[PDB]
Amino acid sequence: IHFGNLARVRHIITYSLSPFEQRAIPNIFSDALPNVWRRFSSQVFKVAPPFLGAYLLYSWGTQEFERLKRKNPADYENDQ
């Protein structure tokens, strides 16, 4: 019996329409896509950063490791 003992609510009217009287995916352009961008925008700078900073570390350590495999001529400039 979880519905009815939830909370004390007063003076709130809500209006909704049967699903068959309205569109399933309305205003894809005018409304939808703009918010998708809005949201992407909002977060991009909180998320992306640390990911990009990881990418570097990856790329750096990944290559620096390869560099440590190649030889350095300065070890043989007299090995005749």
Added chain:
Amino acid sequence: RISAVDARMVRDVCSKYIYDKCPALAAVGPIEQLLDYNRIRSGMYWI
């Protein structure tokens, strides 16, 4: 007109106007327990 009505007639007429239709609903007061138009809409069909 009333003696003309038989069960069979009632079913066909009610089905015609009730069955699977999307209804209008008005709720006033401590209505938390009654809910979801969806659920109510699905109550519009199957015995």
